[PDB]
C-alpha cells in the first residue's frame, strides 16, 4: 500500500562520430540526452541493448 512511480527504462539515441573511412577507422559515440554516468554503470551491468 505504497506509491511507486513508473519511468522510461532508457529511451534515447545513438549517434556515431567518425571521419571518412578513407582517412581512419577510429570512432567516437554519442548517447543522446542521457546522463552517461547511467550508461557507465549500464555497460558494467552489460544491460545496453
Amino acid at each position: 500500500l505504497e506509491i511507486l512511480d513508473i519511468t522510461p527504462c532508457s529511451f534515447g539515441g545513438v549517434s556515431v562520430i567518425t571521419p571518412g573511412t578513407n582517412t581512419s577507422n577510429q570512432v567516437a559515440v554519442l548517447y543522446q540526452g542521457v546522463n552517461c554516468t547511467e550508461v557507465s554503470v549500464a555497460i558494467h551491468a552489460d544491460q545496453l541493448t
Binding site: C9, F11, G13, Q32
Partner: protein, 48 residues
Amino acid sequence: LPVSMTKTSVDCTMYICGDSTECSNLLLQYGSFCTQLKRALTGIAVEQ
C-alpha cells in the same frame, strides 16, 4: 521574425511498438516506410 523551431528525433520502433518483439517484426513487414520519416526529421533539424 522566427528563425528556428524545436528539433525532433522521433523513432519508429520506440514510438510505435514499445519494446515488443512481435510488434517490431510486424512493423518490418511494412518495408522502409518509416526510414523516410527518420530521414525527413534529420533533414528538418539540419535546416533549422
